[PDB]
Design a protein around this nucleic acid. Structure first.
Ligand code: MG
Ligand code: MG
Length: 132
RNA sequence: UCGACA
DNA sequence: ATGTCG
């Protein structure tokens, strides 16, 4: 019951909080469709969030109706709420990731999308295809 | 007091 | 170890 005609997204980090990146892959072929340059400090959930929103923008710009898979219950709820409820301290260190988070929320609040955001079922299907 | 997703 | 929600 994997919807193979989909985009899969994931975060990778070194530390948490720590250096965060993310990418999106074609679920069928594994081809890397986008990959964000590493952000010096962020959280896992911030990156999972940014990855979904990036995915929405990617698909919207390309007139694609493909769903997005994420394994993150947290990020899926933050996107649905249009609100990233991160605990990470907002200070000079974390300014870049908070800026990105702010700009993602703002995109969600200025655009429509129909993309279904689906939970990847890691316990049945193994690791999401975007995994680092 | 946990249970779960990362 | 930490970041998050139910
Ligand atoms: Mg993940
Ligand atoms: Mg993962």
């Amino acid at each position: 019951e994997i919807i193979w005609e989909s985009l899969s997204v994931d975060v990778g980090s070194q530390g948490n909080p720590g250096i965060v990146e993310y990418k999106g892959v074609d679920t069928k072929t594994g081809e890397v469709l986008f990959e964000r340059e590493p952000i010096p400090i962020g959280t896992n959930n911030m990156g999972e969030f940014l990855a979904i929103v990036h995915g929405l923008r990617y698909l919207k710009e390309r007139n694609s109706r493909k769903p997005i898979y994420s394994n993150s219950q947290t990020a899926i709820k933050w996107v649905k709420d249009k609100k990233a409820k991160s605990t990470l301290v907002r200070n000079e260190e974390t300014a870049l990731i908070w800026k990105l988070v702010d700009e993602a929320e703002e995109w969600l609040n200025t655009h429509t999308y129909e993309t279904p955001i689906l939970k990847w079922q890691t316990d049945k299907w193994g690791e999401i295809k975007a995994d680092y």
